[PDB]
Design an enzyme around this catalytic site. Structure first.
Site, PDB file in Angstrom:
ATOM      1  CD  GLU A  61      38.733  49.188  44.321  1.00  0.00           C
ATOM      2  OE1 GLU A  61      39.466  48.175  44.253  1.00  0.00           O
ATOM      3  OE2 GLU A  61      37.775  49.393  43.545  1.00  0.00           O
ATOM      4  CG  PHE A 123      25.288  43.089  41.986  1.00  0.00           C
ATOM      5  CD1 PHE A 123      26.082  42.047  41.532  1.00  0.00           C
ATOM      6  CD2 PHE A 123      25.498  44.360  41.475  1.00  0.00           C
ATOM      7  CE1 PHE A 123      27.069  42.270  40.584  1.00  0.00           C
ATOM      8  CE2 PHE A 123      26.482  44.592  40.529  1.00  0.00           C
ATOM      9  CZ  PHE A 123      27.270  43.547  40.083  1.00  0.00           C
ATOM     10  CD  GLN A 124      29.709  45.182  42.474  1.00  0.00           C
ATOM     11  OE1 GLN A 124      29.409  46.357  42.262  1.00  0.00           O
ATOM     12  NE2 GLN A 124      30.868  44.660  42.089  1.00  0.00           N
ATOM     13  CE  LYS A 173      22.377  53.369  41.921  1.00  0.00           C
ATOM     14  NZ  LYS A 173      22.029  52.367  40.880  1.00  0.00           N
ATOM     15  CG  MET A 496      62.467  40.734  57.878  1.00  0.00           C
ATOM     16  SD  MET A 496      63.904  41.203  58.866  1.00  0.00           S
ATOM     17  CE  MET A 496      63.992  42.952  58.501  1.00  0.00           C
TER      18      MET A 496
END
Ligand SMILES: Cc1cc2nc3c(=O)[nH]c(=O)nc-3n(C[C@H](O)[C@H](O)[C@H](O)COP(=O)(O)OP(=O)(O)OC[C@H]3O[C@@H](n4cnc5c(N)ncnc54)[C@H](O)[C@@H]3O)c2cc1C
Ligand SMILES: Cc1cc2nc3c(=O)[nH]c(=O)nc-3n(C[C@H](O)[C@H](O)[C@H](O)COP(=O)(O)OP(=O)(O)OC[C@H]3O[C@@H](n4cnc5c(N)ncnc54)[C@H](O)[C@@H]3O)c2cc1C
Ligand SMILES: Cc1cc2nc3c(=O)[nH]c(=O)nc-3n(C[C@H](O)[C@H](O)[C@H](O)COP(=O)(O)OP(=O)(O)OC[C@H]3O[C@@H](n4cnc5c(N)ncnc54)[C@H](O)[C@@H]3O)c2cc1C
Ligand SMILES: COc1cnc(OC)n2nc(NS(=O)(=O)c3c(OCC(F)F)cccc3C(F)(F)F)nc12
Ligand SMILES: COc1cnc(OC)n2nc(NS(=O)(=O)c3c(OCC(F)F)cccc3C(F)(F)F)nc12
Ligand SMILES: C/C(NCc1cnc(C)nc1N)=C(/S)CCOP(=O)([O-])OP(=O)([O-])O
Ligand SMILES: C/C(NCc1cnc(C)nc1N)=C(/S)CCOP(=O)([O-])OP(=O)([O-])O
Ligand SMILES: [K+]
Ligand SMILES: [K+]
Ligand SMILES: [Mg+2]
Ligand SMILES: [Mg+2]
Lengths: 601, 601, 219
Positions: A61, A123-124, A173, A496
């Site tokens: 993602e 959950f999640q 949802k 760097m």
């Protein structure tokens, strides 16, 4: 009868997911970057086999986020992200913070656990509205399907107005699975769709100040790119009043660097000519730039001549800025001109006196440009390719195709060398992470830019360490049909950081050498063409093969290690207190490094 | 004289970075996971070539985070993370949220821009204290070097006490570069270092309830693993009172599953025998488990027999829980026993009556175990390898080495099949993302676990989509000398999502098929041994080569696609309202899927 | 105004910068923003039917009514209609006072920490509790684990329990588990509820206890 005209029934019977789909269409979204999951499934079912936009599937993602950023910066449209709850949403936090710092219009839609489960450590479940609050302009959780069209409108409006930036819309949802059973105000089903006297007076006052200036300079940034006419008006102003132009990293391409009036980039690793000029200018015209701490140098010592001029009423700083938060945040503006810089320039320029010549000022400027080129140690017989030379080779060869050329980068030395040694001529062709400075940005940003501009040559100038961060997205480029061109400058170091360790920590390289994969076998595993350049004699033909490719391609170039980016204005120093390249000094540095590391580096 | 005894001068003259180093030593940190950058450079200089701990360099800070999680769960020690400001810090947000949901002790140290630059939208500045507030137990920004030792002590204490979890300590560059010039309280320079009558009475009351029970069941979770004596006391209780034992996903390994009293895992994809037993038990002994919504099924329909027993004063729910927030959060406890479950079990067990036999109860339990095995469609001639069979093969062969075996997983079907079909016998051998459920967890967690346990066999059972998320960390395993064993179950799909799409969305697979790289060429590019199993006849010998390897190794196994994980308790249903495997039903499902997709799936 | 008056009513704040209120509108705005404002889910409908069947089994029902019943003009009317039809005693919270005519024989007065011991005794012995617009506050329930023992037993035996009519999901199953949760405006849902409830003439045993408790527990 009036009430019937103000209410809308056309969405009744649709799920929240289907309403999302319709609203994407109405907002002219042609591309969505995302990844599925349990909480966002009702939306994914609604967009199943949609022919209304292209869907781009990354491997991670964060990839979707940076792709959408690259898309937005190449196209000028908002980048749309669609992810699931929990880890799907927390994985977009870095791209959101990135987009906030660089002013990128990002609209993030994240699935959320059902409202019946919110606040139960479900959950999640992540508190993404709380977590993303500091890295968005605005966010919201939709609580019922009736308000979904309105929230989508608000998100797109906020993301694209003022200083553009990221917004997040949280989608439970059960909301997206629910069906709209009632009419909603018809204005919520549609997207959208004079200068204050205070600003008008400021503009007139600013014009009178410029008309007195004897040493003017334009300091232009990303803001000038947020209007198609921006660069045009910048050029018109510079031509009319005969003013040299320097830009930020994010402003690169706003001004044709082939023009004699171009002072190139200013700042920590900008041209010493540009830095010298701004420190000596009596009038500074800041166009869509925010006086960032990589640009100003030591703030108390910044722009001494312009501050003196202001106090004596013959110059100063004229700041064209759209966000009040960034007016008088870092430096006091002599005149602040609030609003879109391009629109305000239309009112400004006719009040500005036309000027034929500035003999003394431009004599100094030409002298400074002559003594301050981007010098470096050239190749020697048997040496590795110098990274500065590589950039020049790519810049020269790329400009000979009859196609637009868009450059993305990672973060580090390669990024600065790309900024310095490309010749920038067109708007929205430098797509680079400047404010947050996110390693791993280069590859997914290139994919996003390539999707926005299918006929463009898109080149990701990347570091080996940066490329390692997100190299899994190579598969994503193939699956999306994006023929990006990745060039990895392989110095086998976090260059760097080693530059700063060489300079300030007596060549103590603490954990700044990560091991690299075989980049040619990697490219092969990803079904991507691979090219490796290992010596000076392969540089030209290798770059040509790279650019001639009509498929995704990964070019690895072995380059000189432990080479500093110069010029450099060290942190805490005035802008004109810079370190310049010197051949003898570099040689001494090499000997010292060799001795201190027992010949290891 | 007393004041001299209470103050300490020994750190005077040290930089903040050097003080950090010393405090790591005093907290017995033997491993640090991290990645350098500008803001954290003073700390990296201080730990340069330290022989006091092992430093592990990932390719991405998310990698560092999940590695530290894997380390913590394998070792029982806190996992220490060291990253830079901005994107370095925002990249650890997903691991922090992950660690919060799963109760993992994580101490994150993030570099921050100098205090002189905070709040100015500085170079690489993120508001990480604001952003991480919802995904940490506690966080803080150090504002001066004098308070640095105290803040480090507080972080470690908070991370490891109560329910363990992540904390973040923000370290401004000028603080870590500054030198301590004053004495500090001597207690801040050192780490650390009876039961309430209320709890004691609750324990006695709980014992009397259990001594009445005719159908008891133990429901054990991760909490029992947070003490070395945990599993021992769990076994002692089960043996004494003759009680069957079921565990959560995170409790796997707390109880020897070879024991006749083992009911295996309960929940959405747990054994139907375990689910049936808990729905019929008159007394439920919850040991270090939080009644998560993947376990309880429909809450209003959960544990009917235990609620009835409570109302009739002959049973109920006995909850041993250390965090008051999780007591009576989901279900009402008949008796709540607050504190460390292992310590409280020591007081509990002697009050519990010894029981020889439970003929009726165990007759039911044995009957349920017989009719509810983890059944599935076996291989047929010419078919691909079934994923359930693969797991069994690995479980059987791994158990024949004279080494501890630790399993990590990604997220999806492979994760559930690993949970079901391994035989779990030892504590801290299942290391899996349960609460947040983060894809990409498997590989870095394995690296972290392998570093914690250098003599263990560490197996990452991964999905192809999950593995794609973070596959760059393969190089990290090689550089760290961690001989992890990665097994990718390649079904060329996001199987867990396609399972739900097959079930609820009529086989509309919306963006759930990501393209995979050539995993053998990938392994080769990463300098990792590669093995590919493509048919049934290569399964045994291929798994043996996998386990016999003494180097990092990637095994790819081609497995059957579009196979559901069963049993399954659908969301919203009671725990004993489950879907069971049936051969004829699977065949019909295959035909339907084939027809609906035109033979594509 | 919309947020303040919908769901569970509550306070909102609108911050007005001086230069905004002094500034003059120079552009047109969507006409819907210049005007104020201006069916039951199958899930709730099924819950209501289920709740009715539970009440129709009850032998010792009690109504526990609160402030929510006052947020509709028809509220008290429907409360009285339900109590009369199914012959149910009524107790209220402090904030529910006035929702039911306390001169009515079915009135059990206020419950809670300083409520009538008759009301408190009745709710502890009821097999069905009908909670109408009340949030089970800790001044009302007493010790939560020991609250409503007879109703919890009845629920477990499928012959009673707690029926919660509540407009805010946050306050459903926050303190005590509802046997049936009926989400939405209590007054609107009562209109659907009452016709499904069986009319009852007498409850000799239950009201004998209630009358006895009222006699021995005056203020
Ligand atoms: C390793 C590294 C080194 C760097 N060194 C340098 C360097 O040497 N030189 C350099 O320049 N940068 C450097 N940077 C980048 C630097 O950090 C900033 O990101 C960059 O300077 C910002 O440029 P900007 O002000 O033009 O763009 P922005 O940060 O996007 O600011 C744009 C400003 O214009 C305003 N604006 C936006 N739209 C409009 C509009 N329509 N009308 C009017 N105003 C508008 C915005 O509100 C904002 O105030 C470096 C970055 C890295 C990672
Ligand atoms: C795809 C998927 C499917 C899943 N399906 C299932 C499934 O079918 N079955 C299943 O079980 N899980 C499943 N889960 C996992 C589930 O989501 C939870 O993560 C898991 O059930 C939590 O188990 P736990 O309560 O034992 O651990 P935790 O979530 O860590 O809870 C432990 C509890 O014990 C407490 N505690 C901690 N230490 C102590 C101590 N020293 N003394 C006393 N108490 C203590 C904690 O405060 C906490 O309340 C699934 C996850 C995924 C990703
Ligand atoms: C010194 C003192 C002593 C006290 N002792 C007592 C005592 O002995 N007994 C007592 O009862 N109180 C007592 N209290 C008051 C107590 O604290 C609470 O304020 C009170 O019990 C709350 O009553 P309530 O639930 O009816 O109202 P509220 O707190 O307002 O709750 C109303 C509930 O109904 C819901 N609701 C609102 N509108 C609707 C609608 N249209 N449809 C459906 N639902 C709706 C609301 O969301 C809320 O859940 C005392 C207070 C003090 C200061
Ligand atoms: C292991 O659980 C899931 C696995 N795979 C899934 O889709 C690919 N889903 N989808 C769900 N949805 S869920 O069950 O209603 C649910 C959820 O269920 C609450 C209750 F209805 F069970 C709670 C929190 C999150 C979710 C989420 F985000 F996953 F939707 N659960 C799973
Ligand atoms: C491009 O700027 C840097 C590049 N590489 C670096 O180390 C590998 N650093 N390190 C810094 N430090 S800094 O310049 O004092 C600074 C900073 O400087 C404020 C002022 F002193 F210039 C402001 C915000 C952040 C940082 C940071 F996080 F990078 F430390 N700047 C850079
Ligand atoms: C570690 C670091 N910066 C800190 C850092 C850490 N982590 C992230 C995500 N981003 C940044 N910017 C750099 S610039 C190393 C860059 O190495 P490189 O990608 O190979 O580029 P180069 O060697 O040319 O400097
Ligand atoms: C997309 C998704 N879940 C949503 C999701 C999205 N993004 C993240 C970071 N995590 C999760 N859990 C799953 S479970 C797909 C898993 O695919 P897999 O790794 O190949 O495993 P398998 O096919 O065995 O189910
Ligand atoms: K240039
Ligand atoms: K098992
Ligand atoms: Mg490099
Ligand atoms: Mg898969």
């Amino acid at each position: 009868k009036k009430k019937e005209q103000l209410m809308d029934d056309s969405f009744i019977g649709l799920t929240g997911g289907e309403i999302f789909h319709e609203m994407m269409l109405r907002h002219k979204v042609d591309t969505v970057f995302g990844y599925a999951g349990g909480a966002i499934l009702p939306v994914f079912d609604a967009i199943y086999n949609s022919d209304k936009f292209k869907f781009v599937l990354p491997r991670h993602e964060q990839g979707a986020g940076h792709m959408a950023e690259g898309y937005a910066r190449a196209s000028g449209k908002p980048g749309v992200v669609l992810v699931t709850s929990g880890p799907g949403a927390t994985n977009v936090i870095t791209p959101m913070a990135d987009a906030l710092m660089d002013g990128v219009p990002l609209v993030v839609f994240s699935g959320q656990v059902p409202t019946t489960a919110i606040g139960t450590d479900a959950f999640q479940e992540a508190d993404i509205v709380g977590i993303s609050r500091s890295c968005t302009k605005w966010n919201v959780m939709v609580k019922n399907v009736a308000e979904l069209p309105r929230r989508i409108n608000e998100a797109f409006e906020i993301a694209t107005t003022g200083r553009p930036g990221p917004v997040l819309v949280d989608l439970p949802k059960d909301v997206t699975a629910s069906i709209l059973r009632e009419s909603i105000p018809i204005n919520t089903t549609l997207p959208s769709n004079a200068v204050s006297e205070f600003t008008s007076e400021a503009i007139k006052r600013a014009a009178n100040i410029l008309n007195k200036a004897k040493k003017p300079i334009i300091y232009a940034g990303a803001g000038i790119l947020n209007n198609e006419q921006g660069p045009k008006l910048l050029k018109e102003l510079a031509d009319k009043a005969n003013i040299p132009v320097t830009t930020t990293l994010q402003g690169l391409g706003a001004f044709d660097q082939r023009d004699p009036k171009s002072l190139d980039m200013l700042g920590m690793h900008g041209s010493a000519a540009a830095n010298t000029a701004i420190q000596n200018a009596d009038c500074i015209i800041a166009l869509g730039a925010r006086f960032d701490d990589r640009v100003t140098g030591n703030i108390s010592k910044f722009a001494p001549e312009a501050k003196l001029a202001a106090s004596e009423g013959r110059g100063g700083i004229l700041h064209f800025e759209i966000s009040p938060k960034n007016i008088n945040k870092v430096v006091e503006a002599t005149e602040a001109i609030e609003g879109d810089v391009t629109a305000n320039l239309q009112s400004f320029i006719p009040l500005v006196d036309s000027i034929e010549n500035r003999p003394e000022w431009f004599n100094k400027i030409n002298e400074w440009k002559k003594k301050y080129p981007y010098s470096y140690q050239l190749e020697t017989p048997g040496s590795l390719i110098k990274p500065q030379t590589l950039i020049k080779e790519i810049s020269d060869q790329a400009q000979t195709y009859n196609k637009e050329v868009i450059v993305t980068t990672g973060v580090g030395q390669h990024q600065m060398w790309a900024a310095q040694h490309f010749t920038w001529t067109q708007p929205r062709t430098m797509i680079t992470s400047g404010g947050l400075g996110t390693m791993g940005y280069g590859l997914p940003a290139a994919i996003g830019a390539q999707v926005a501009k299918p006929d463009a040559i898109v080149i990701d100038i990347d570091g080996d360490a940066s490329f390692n961060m997100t190299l899994t997205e190579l598969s994503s480029a193939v699956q999306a049909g994006a023929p990006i061109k990745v060039c990895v400058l392989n110095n086998e170091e976090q260059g760097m950081v080693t530059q700063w360790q060489s300079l300030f920590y007596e060549h103590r390289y603490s954990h700044t050498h990560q091991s690299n994969p075989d980049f040619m076998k990697l490219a092969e595993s990803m079904n991507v063409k691979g090219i490796r350049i290992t010596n000076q004699q392969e540089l030209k033909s290798g770059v040509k093969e790279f650019l001639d490719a009509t498929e995704p391609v990964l070019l690895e170039v072995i380059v000189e290690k432990k080479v500093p980016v110069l010029p450099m204005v060290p942190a805490g120093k005035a802008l004109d207190d810079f370190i310049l390249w010197d051949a003898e000094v570099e040689k001494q540095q090499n000997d010292l490094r060799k001795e201190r590391t027992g010949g290891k580096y």
